Amino acid sequence: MHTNWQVCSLVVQAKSERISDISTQLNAFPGCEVAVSDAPSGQLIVVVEAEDSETLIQTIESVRNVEGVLAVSLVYHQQEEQGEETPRSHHHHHH
Structure with missing residues (x-):
């Protein structure tokens, strides 16, 4: 299927x-x-x-x-996952 994909620009700093x-x-x-x-x-x-x-x-x-690439600056960045100290509601039900 065509999923809701995302495009992301990358500012690549590389050897000129x-x-x-x-x-x-x-x-x-x-x-x-x-x-x-x-x-x-x-x-x-x-x-x-x-x-x-x-x-x-x-x-x-x-x-x-x-x-060749020195730094890749991702135009779309999130935080680190970090870890959730107290989980949320999961709905993985076998029944």
Whole structure:
């Protein structure tokens, strides 16, 4: 099915010299499109669209595993999971 997926822009700070290699490689990722490419600053805007939030993470983490990327600033970020000290209502019923 077509799930309610989310797109996320990535401000990729990378080696300004190596921008051509990095952009080419990143645009070859699944769901990743290089929208904006500013070679002078080393900024690559990559928009990633993925089905589930976790599928997005799987993809974005791979983006951050490229040599050339210095910092990936995710335009859409949440807090850490942290852990809930007192759980909420779960409705996992077998019956």
